[PDB]
Amino acid sequence: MNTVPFTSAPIEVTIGIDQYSFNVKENQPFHGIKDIPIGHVHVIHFQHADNSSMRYGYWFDCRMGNFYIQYDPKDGLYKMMEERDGAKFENIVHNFKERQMMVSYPKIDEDDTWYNLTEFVQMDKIRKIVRKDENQFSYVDSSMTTVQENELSDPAHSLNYTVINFKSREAIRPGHEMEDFLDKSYYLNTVMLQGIFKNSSNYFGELQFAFLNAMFFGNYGSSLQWHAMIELICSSATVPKHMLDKLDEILYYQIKTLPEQYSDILLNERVWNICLYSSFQKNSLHNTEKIMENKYPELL
Amino acid sequence: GAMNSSNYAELFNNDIKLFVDDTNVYRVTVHKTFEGNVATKAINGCIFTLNPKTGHLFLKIIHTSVWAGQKRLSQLAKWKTAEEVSALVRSLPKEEQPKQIIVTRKAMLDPLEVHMLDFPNIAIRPTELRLPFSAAMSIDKLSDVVMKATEPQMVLFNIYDDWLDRISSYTAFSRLTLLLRALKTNEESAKMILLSDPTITIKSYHLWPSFTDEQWITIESQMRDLILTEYGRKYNV
Ligand SMILES: CONC(=O)COc1ccc(C)cc1OC
Ligand SMILES: CONC(=O)COc1ccc(C)cc1OC
């Protein structure tokens, strides 16, 4: 188990850790989070009490270094930093633990939610989507735009997701216009899977990362990317059987996790109705269709 | 974006543009089979591609063999239309390629956009106008060339005959659409109007009779009366 200590909590803030949230009050004696499961990526994230504008946060993996949070009163935010002095860090953490100044990641032992939402997410891939190579952790926020959003503005602060555009020359072979636009298997299998992602695990990892950014930060470009990557699969007549089974599982846990109150803005009605009821794969997502129909029958 | 009554004069500016109408691309007769079921027999069709400024009509005849062994023909027809329009553009010298293509039905937008991805500066647009271009097969000489074709073929016409010698393209187009509207609403009456007077003939190199300005005014009035007439007969007014 690992720890993210906090120097202090000088401003009142909603703290998100993965799918969990809790409230810290202005100048409360809070010195961080402990018992963080080793083995997964994680995201710590914030929503200032006094300005719910700009949720922001950090993707990290505790195996990749010793990280802490420190409020920066000039920039006005909780910043992640790396402590390189290992013995300083262990000493700091041990004291905060002895004084019980840390809340504990309260993973239920029956609970595989976080694993199921991050199964294919790798820190190394996150770091290529979020370019800031002097840190081992990755900052994201509500307002960051995607490479594709900028084509349609600061390139350093962008989300470099893989560009998907069904009416592009990359997506459409000369001479197979109608075939490739109505059945996108070439684009999925040859262009994206074999060409860009190399395998379906990296593809699913981006899809999962896009949803999480979309739900945690209300990042609109992330929501577009998630829906695009779902639609590309559902609109392909030819998809490996194991990808469809995995995709059903991935979407099921994303919908299950999706808070009921957040669904009107995170769920695209056109894409879901198309995917579940009209597309080639309309019969191949049983778990996802069952949970969607029982939880969000309004959207359908 | 879309083309409507507000920006109607854009049709006649100096930016090259083409209307594409796909309504006569895929044509069928429906008949009973010996077993008492129903079946379709396709007949030849045409893409109707018109420069509204010049009157140049690029009539791409669609021979029934292009449907042989194909499924979902109504959807294929839209992709075949787009393919043929894209090939037409590619065949034209750069300075003759359109800057805009306006499709008369919205279902044509995605097929044509996809076929024209190589031409990102050609704007593909819908229109809110209800143009009567489906009536083009009521023009005898265009109907004759489609039905006689034994293979795919492109025929080039000027749908305004020599009108631009005497009127603007705005007026020529307004005449064309009023003629086609009438032919669409009551073909027999419209043809009767157009041919009643045997002293006015259609030149061999024309589609419409050789009316003087004054006779066109009469004709145009009689077509308006026909359209109004049929409107009454239809709605009981
Ligand atoms: C505002 O509460 N604190 C947040 O950061 C909430 O944002 C989330 C949205 C949805 C879920 C399931 C969890 C979340 O993170 C905890
Ligand atoms: C089940 O746990 N209850 C929750 O959902 C939210 O409570 C917390 C969750 C996670 C952490 C680190 C701290 C928490 O409160 C201090």
From Swiss-Prot, chain A:
Free-text description of this protein's post-translational modifications in UniProt: Phosphorylated on serine and tyrosine residues.
One GO-annotated biological process of the protein: spliceosomal snRNP assembly
Signal peptide feature range: none
Phosphoserine: residues carrying this PTM: 236
In-chain residues carrying the UniProt-annotated modification Phosphothreonine: 257
Transmembrane region(s): none
Any single Pfam family the record assigns to this protein: AAR2_1st
Effect of residue 236 to A: No effect on interaction with PRP8
Chief localisation class: cytoplasm
Keywords from the named record: Cytoplasm, mRNA processing, mRNA splicing, Nucleus, Phosphoprotein
Lineage top rank: taxon: Eukaryota
Region (Leucine-zipper): 244-265
Comment field (misc): Present with 7330 molecules/cell in log phase SD medium.
Protein family membership: Belongs to the AAR2 family.
Function per UniProt: Component of the U5 snRNP complex that is required for spliceosome assembly and for pre-mRNA splicing. Involved in splicing pre-mRNA of the A1 cistron and other genes that are important for cell growth.
Oligomeric form and interacting partners: Heterodimer. Interacts with PRP8 (via RNase H homology domain and MPN domain), competing with BRR2 for the same binding site. Component of a U5 snRNP complex that contains at least the U5 snRNA, PRP8, SNU114, AAR2, SMB1, SMD1, SMD2, SMD3, SME1, SMX2 and SMX3, but is not a component of the U4/U6-U5 tri-snRNP complex.
Protein name: A1 cistron-splicing factor AAR2
Protein source organism: Saccharomyces cerevisiae (strain ATCC 204508 / S288c)
Native organism taxonomy: Eukaryota, Fungi, Dikarya, Ascomycota, Saccharomycotina
Swiss-Prot record, chain B:
Protein role: Functions as a scaffold that mediates the ordered assembly of spliceosomal proteins and snRNAs. Required for association of BRR2 with the spliceosomal U5 snRNP, and the subsequent assembly of the U4/U6-U5 tri-snRNP complex. Functions as a scaffold that positions spliceosomal U2, U5 and U6 snRNAs at splice sites on pre-mRNA substrates, so that splicing can occur. Interacts with both the 5' and the 3' splice site, as well as the branch region. Has a role in branch site-3' splice site selection. Associates with the branch site-3' splice 3'-exon region. Also has a role in cell cycle.
Resulting phenotype, residue 21 to N: Reduced growth at 30 degrees Celsius. Strongly reduced growth at 16 degrees Celsius
Domain remarks in the Swiss-Prot or TrEMBL record: The MPN (JAB/Mov34) domain has structural similarity with deubiquitinating enzymes, but lacks the residues that would bind the catalytic metal ion. Contains a region with structural similarity to reverse transcriptase, presenting the classical thumb, fingers and palm architecture, but lacks enzyme activity, since the essential metal-binding residues are not conserved.
Organism: Saccharomyces cerevisiae (strain ATCC 204508 / S288c)
Segments of this protein annotated with the region RNase H homology domain: 7-237
Originating gene: PRP8
Protein name in UniProt: Pre-mRNA-splicing factor 8
Outcome of substituting residue 21 to A: Alters protein folding. Severely impaired growth. Strongly reduced growth at 35 degrees Celsius
More details: Present with 468 molecules/cell in log phase SD medium.
Subunit relationships: Component of the U4/U6-U5 tri-snRNP complex composed of the U4, U6 and U5 snRNAs and at least PRP3, PRP4, PRP6, PRP8, PRP18, PRP31, PRP38, SNU13, SNU23, SNU66, SNU114, SPP381, SMB1, SMD1, SMD2, SMD3, SMX2, SMX3, LSM2, LSM3, LSM4, LSM5, LSM6, LSM7, LSM8, BRR2 and DIB1.
Subcellular location: Nucleus
